Design a protein around this ligand. Structure first.
Ligand code: NAD
Ligand code: NAD
Ligand code: NAD
Ligand code: NAD
Ligand code: ZN
Ligand code: ZN
Ligand code: ZN
Ligand code: ZN
Ligand code: ZN
Ligand code: ZN
Ligand code: ZN
Ligand code: ZN
Lengths: 343, 343, 343, 343
């Protein structure tokens, strides 16, 4: 079995060759058909702070993957051999406050596939049976591979009051913010504004946004004010950029909602009273995918065709050419990159 | 000025010549550009049980309309002369338990234009200033004229948990149901099924619904089982047909939501324990339009093009030819019929 | 081991003597310390329609019970030997629409302890480990035994908009409606009205209600109107009595919520339009306990002392004297009856 | 008439003799029976940064008061002469995006009695008719006078998911925090912890909180760990102290809610990713009182006795002795100080 792994406390990844793992009680063996990469894999790649204080080599990485169920552990009745399944990366403890409360997306003992244990950057991987989401056989594995990150967008968009019949400002047109714009557009939001200084990705939202904006070339606040008449009702933050955050909040009309998925790199300067309290803003910190509700909403949009994730898949490279795949990541020249573990 | 009114407790309406109403404090004078007809108007027209117990001749009917603010009463700050407006038919008291709660759509003292007082089937109509929703000057009056019934659809769809990423079944492809079909399609529901025995009407849903069903030709329940694998998460009831209701409630999965706008003509046989309680269903009684929240969502969808009502405007006729107009609606071989009070 | 079981398709129960069951994978063995009875056990007792079309003798009954964890199945890490636990009677499939959706209280393949499989009317019983709710050692088993039905009240009360700062009308002062009145009173509802023609139980709510009402001796509608000024905001239905249902709905102000737990014996005559739709009422069909959310809210009220369930425990009889316990049930002369399986 | 006003941009206030204001269209004349003082009034009194940028002398201050409707302007249907009323300090415009949404508490054009125009620190005050909340004639004016700040507590507590059956931590035992403590206790929260270094104040919470904590004496976080076994489900922030905020946000369990009313004096250092996003926390910015929804809930609790504010009224003094009154509040050795404008 071909697999991509982090073998030591250092930069880069190593294409190794492991024995096909066997599933046990409550587990299944997935024969990966497609996998994708995101900023998290990049952190590991670069072997930065985050990675250093979290990754325990040796580890086969990859948390965005899809495939077929090859065999199941003893006593596993679901899913079944032959099922096409996408994977939920978070493995929840089912024994902490968050889990009783039903907030599995924030289980205090979360274990992320490809971050804490072997992931999908391999021809085969073993995962908990409860983490497999069965997909119709006709859903392409390449789209199926990005359902996990798509779920991050879905969760952010549908959190709080949703976006149907509401004015939306999405700050950040990265892969996720991009899926968000696809979702909000299909959810009936309007007007829909998407802001991102990078024109490459910003152009990707043109067919979904009502107004594209380069905060560097144009004054976002003024554009929003010209498009809505005042502010937006919902703010979907996917940039993690302090300047964008403060800007987004100002664009919000009093009493509106700010749904934040973006992870800033450093603590921000925040005027609680001015940006949140006095304006009656509600800030929703979005993490992971609401376990199952997010997957239902998301896959429903995808299965029925309300959204088409195909245009976000810019490159598909054999797993063996991972080096280039990660270079595209750092580059930013691609949206989502699919890795074929079979080559 | 030309006007259409019920001049005595009996069938039909009479084209009459009334003087132009005068707007006083807190009122405005609206020059009607377009008006539409609905089931209610048919009730009044036929003079059935419903009408007999609610209408008090002499009454100028018409509650679905739009026009220009030709004049405003002393002290009326908004809207303004020249403004293009759609009208909220319900006039609330601001002095009842419902109003104090914000549930203006169920004001204990609700008064309805074209029902309790003179409506829009005339060249001019005086309404409360606060009932005029100013539209963009470029919105076609015909569409503006049907924002009221559109709101009934909007209210129903966005009530409760909404429909984004949810399987939806719509019983009733009448005008309001079709509008609901447009809205849910534009809101990201899926799969989307619409049921109605009138083929002429069921057809207008073809571009919005994922599955059309003639309950007389097919077993709606079994069709839903195939389309969703079990039931729908949301049932939007717009028929008022007892059989449809029980059927619709059966197509609901346990824990689902039933949003009901439909007005059944007679009490129904209801197995409370079997159709609601034991299945954890929640039934939402939908009445009117949430004041402003519904208009915001609905006009947002319309203004931005998320939805396009134009295909619902099947007929146009001068007010002088109302007889023909009501006959059409009566036949059910029409969706939204527009009356022009100027001719 | 002493156990009470239904051994044949007939009335009554038989005190038998079985071998102590052994827990297996994912199971635990509970040494019951206290058990209680409700209308469901009564149905079985009487061997009526419900029971006949649901009970498969031989069966050890009882679903309201508490006790200590004696031993656990192999591989069970929670709960632990020594833990005091109350039991959730519903065993969910974790493989049906309702479960993905998180509505376990309505799992389509629910299996009720003491209704579909051996229950707690025995010194020992084996149940799924996930169904045990650990309680502090100092919570009396007698109170712990009724947490299950208390959860039915909690679920009804906190469904929808809750009751804090709201006027409440509870129709039905049976054991459950009684716990409800205790809950709403502790949740800050007010004014609080409790209606029940049976003065025995109606008096039990005196220390919790603001107004007790005998619908037979007094006109409920008038009392509500005198206490609130119009109607109540919330209706908690626990009687299943058609007359009470129609009455309760009328007492509701337009736009209010009706939370229904009560199971009517026959289909009711329901005027959808008049009692629900036109008044903008939302009817919440409450079933079971929201899996875990209900238990959290409920046990929180109980552990912190916000509510004291002690006064609802009117009788405690040895299990061997079940005959009398069931007679009290039918009698209605008691609230909750505790059965001591150790005698 | 006697009045207390800021007559120039500097410290202190001046007892002056102003003529009796006259109520015009849509207004009423209120004869003040009692008024209270709050932090805002202290700001104005000290003439600090906050005041300097908001106050425009000459200003009669006082926004927390109650009295009798002595007169009404032409056409004022409600309230009526003789009515006992409490006043909503915020005067909304009914013509901004916040108002159209119903979020009147954050009206873009909010005007505040005793801040932007003459308030209640006088024998008479003219206010908008719609700002008068009629109370039962038997409610003590002193209590009626503090329903405004009480509403800030109510709004905070019932925002989001409320507090029933939930563990709650309250940071800030200032007047509003104590009121929140009363409310949560009466709403069924538990365990309930309140934190504040001022022992004089922390003490008033003793009868409502389950655990009192002096963050200077004990480690609040570790105390919460012992009381709940982990964290609280809800954090009600009423201090505005940065340290308290971070601490409070840490005591929150993942997926919890932080409702913030507290106004920090300076921007804070906020690790958005660590304190909000990654932990799935939702921060609710609380401003003012939801118009009518908050007053309903709050007066409901008060009218029915679910809560009793009397113990919060620590001092009473004629308006002529405001100096003494402000000094007390300034020392923090007082909770709600009542000023009597008649003396
Ligand atoms: N909360 C969670 O569980 C979770 C999960 C996965 C990813 N994330 C985070 O969510 C964010 C979005 O993910 P992504 O893959 O799209 O990231 P990305 O870094 O690829 O995209 C961020 C985008 O922000 C844009 N941006 C920068 N400054 C901006 C500004 N001032 N205004 C508007 N846009 C601006 C950039 O052009 C960039 O395309 C990242 O910060 C990521 O780390 C969070
Ligand atoms: N609650 C409110 O405030 C409010 C406001 C306006 C209208 N309404 C009511 O809402 C409903 C919708 O309005 P509309 O103008 O679209 O009504 P409509 O009468 O034009 O349409 C009702 C449709 O139900 C269809 N139908 C009949 N039996 C059916 C069945 N067995 N299964 C599926 N469909 C079936 C009919 O063919 C018809 O097209 C009406 O009942 C109306 O009275 C309520
Ligand atoms: N939905 C569920 O999952 C679920 C679970 C358990 C029990 N239940 C049902 O909930 C209901 C309440 O349970 P319970 O144990 O308190 O039942 P119960 O039968 O002991 O009490 C019902 C009460 O209704 C009262 N009542 C009858 N007519 C009335 C009227 N006209 N007005 C006011 N009160 C009236 C009676 O005096 C009686 O005390 C029952 O119908 C029970 O079968 C439902
Ligand atoms: N958002 C709004 O519309 C609105 C309206 C009114 C008041 N407020 C604000 O709400 C807050 C509460 O009002 P108040 O009158 O009760 O305020 P207050 O100033 O009387 O009380 C604040 C309390 O915080 C306590 N405190 C200080 N450090 C603490 C710490 N480290 N941990 C715990 N407690 C600590 C203080 O001892 C003090 O008693 C204030 O900040 C006020 O400015 C906001
Ligand atoms: Zn990823
Ligand atoms: Zn967990
Ligand atoms: Zn109509
Ligand atoms: Zn009203
Ligand atoms: Zn029971
Ligand atoms: Zn299930
Ligand atoms: Zn104040
Ligand atoms: Zn405003």
């Amino acid at each position: 079995m071909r697999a991509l792994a982090k073998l030591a406390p250092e930069e880069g990844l190593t294409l190794v060759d492991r024995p096909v793992p066997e599933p046990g009680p409550g587990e299944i063996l997935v024969r990966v058909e497609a996998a994708s990469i995101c900023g998290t894999d990049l952190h590991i790649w670069k072997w930065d702070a985050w990675a250093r204080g979290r990754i325990r080599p040796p580890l086969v990485t990859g948390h965005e993957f899809s495939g077929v169920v090859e065999a199941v552990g003893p006593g596993v009745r679901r899913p079944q051999v032959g099922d096409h399944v996408s994977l939920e990366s978070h493995i929840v403890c089912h024994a902490c406050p968050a889990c009783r409360t039903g907030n599995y997306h924030v289980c205090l003992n979360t274990q992320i596939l490809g971050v804490d244990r072997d992931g999908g950057f391999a021809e085969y991987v073993v995962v908990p049976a409860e983490n497999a989401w069965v997909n119709p056989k006709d859903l392409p594995f390449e789209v199926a591979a990005i359902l996990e990150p798509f779920g991050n967008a879905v969760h952010t968009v549908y959190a709080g009051s949703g976006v149907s019949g509401k004015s939306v400002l999405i700050t950040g047109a990265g892969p996720i913010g991009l899926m968000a714009a696809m979702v909000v557009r299909a959810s009936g939001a309007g007007p829909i504004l998407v802001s991102d200084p990078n024109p490459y990705r910003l152009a990707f939202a043109r067919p979904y946004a009502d107004r594209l904006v380069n905060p560097l070339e144009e004054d976002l606040l003024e554009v929003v004010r010209r498009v809505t008449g005042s502010g937006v009702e919902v703010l979907l933050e996917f940039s993690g950029n302090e300047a964008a955050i403060h800007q987004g909040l100002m664009a919000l009309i009093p009493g509106g909602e700010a749904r934040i998925l973006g992870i800033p790199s450093d603590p921000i300067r925040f005027d609680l009273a001015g940006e949140l309290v006095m304006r009656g803003i509600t800030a929703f910190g979005i993490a992971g995918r609401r376990l199952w509700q997010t997957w239902m909403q998301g896959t429903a949009l995808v299965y029925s065709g309300r959204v088409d994730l195909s245009p976000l898949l810019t490159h598909r490279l054999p797993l063996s050419r991972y080096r280039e795949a990660f270079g595209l990541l750092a580059s930013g020249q691609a949206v989502k990159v699919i890795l074929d573990p079979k080559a």
